[PDB]
Amino acid sequence: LPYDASKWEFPRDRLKLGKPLQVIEADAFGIDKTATCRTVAVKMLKEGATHSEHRALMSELKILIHIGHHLNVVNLLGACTKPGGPLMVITEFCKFGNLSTYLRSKRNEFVPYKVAPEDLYKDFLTLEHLICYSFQVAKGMEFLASRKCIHRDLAARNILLSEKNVVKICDFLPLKWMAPETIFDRVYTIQSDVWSFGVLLWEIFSLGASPYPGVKIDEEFCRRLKEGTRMRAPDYTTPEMYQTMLDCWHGEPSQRPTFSELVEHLGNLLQANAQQDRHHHHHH
Numbered sequence: 392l393p394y395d396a397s398k399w400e401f402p403r404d405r406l407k408l409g410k411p412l413q414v415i416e417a418d419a420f421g422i423d424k425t426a427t428c429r430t431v432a433v434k435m436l437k438e439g440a441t442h443s444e445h446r447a448l449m450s451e452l453k454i455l456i457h458i459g460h461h462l463n464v465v466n467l468l469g470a471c472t473k474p475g476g477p478l479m480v481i482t483e484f485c486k487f488g489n490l491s492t493y494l495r496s497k498r499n500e501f502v503p504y505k506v507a508p509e510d511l512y513k514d515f516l517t518l519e520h521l522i523c524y525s526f527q528v529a530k531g532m533e534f535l536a537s538r539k540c541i542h543r544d545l546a547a548r549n550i551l552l553s554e555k556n557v558v559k560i561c562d563f564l565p566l567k568w569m570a571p572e573t574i575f576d577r578v579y580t581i582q583s584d585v586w587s588f589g590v591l592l593w594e595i596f597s598l599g600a601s602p603y604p605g606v607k608i609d610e611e612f613c614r615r616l617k618e619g620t621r622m623r624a625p626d627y628t629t630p631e632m633y634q635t636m637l638d639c640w641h642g643e644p645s646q647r648p649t650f651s652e653l654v655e656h657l658g659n660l661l662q663a664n665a666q667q668d669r670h671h672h673h674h675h
């Protein structure tokens with residue numbers, strides 16, 4: 392893959408590094424044509440990285456360039472790659488952090504839908520929010536899958552909350568997100584990402600709970616998963632959303648929905664939910 396320096400290269404002295412999130416928060420001067428000073432996130436190699444470790448982050452940068460822009464994938468802004476300092480990959484900064492942590496903090500601030508007076512539920516999460524986060528991640532994953540990309544670590548911890556309830560796919564016990572074929576055969580495909588998406592759905596509709604609550608992650612866990620045991624419906628799910636999780640958790644990878652099918656399905660459930668809400672709002 393190519394690296395186009397004229398488009399992407401950013402001077403190192405235009406950054407002020409801040410607190411670690413290695414991924415670090417930073418201030419960037421003149422990275423945009425939209426503003427002078429902007430907060431950003433920087434991924435860089437620690438002191439004493441090898442030639443091969445340098446190649447890994449470089450290949451990741453090129454892949455982000457090749458992938459291109461989507462609202463639901465953390466947006467690359469620039470890079471420091473030329474000699475004189477460490478390799479640095481610069482993206483937008485999502486100040487609200489990961490989705491798991493956020494959902495966990497909203498557990499006392501949930502109603503399934505809003506009615507009048509709406510101020511009683513100011514900044515509350517609703518079913519529209521949860522389905523909307525799901526829909527957004529599905530679209531970002533359909534964008535990635537279309538470009539022959541496999542995420543490999545799709546989990547709520549790798550979903551970022553931005554302004555105006557926009558979520559973004561990023562890449563910061565992992566076994567609880569892995570498909571059976573990934574565990575037992577070390578096979579990574581787009582279909583195994585769909586499995587992980589299902590576990591991500593469970594996380595959203597449990598408001599940031601840890602998958603397989605109270606289950607020891609040993610050889611018995613893997614045995615039962617391969618043999619068809621699944622998580623039970625989480626506390627904030629709808630019946631259709633739980634069925635969607637089960638679909639993502641199909642034993643045969645080819646029998647799981649595609650991200651394209653998930654985008655259409657979740658979009659329809661978002662619309663049905665909104666139509667329901669408008670009726671709740673009207674009659675009360």
Ligand SMILES: Cc1ccn(-c2cccc(C(F)(F)F)c2)c(=O)c1-c1ccc2nc(N)ncc2c1
Pocket residue numbers: 412414432433434451455464465480481482483484485486488489542551560561562563
């Ligand atoms: C800084 C950076 C650089 C690269 N990537 C990255 C690497 C590989 C893949 C991807 C993906 F999945 F978005 F395509 C993204 C990143 O996800 C990030 C990244 C990581 C954590 C972040 N956390 C916050 N709060 N904001 C932005 C972040 C960016």
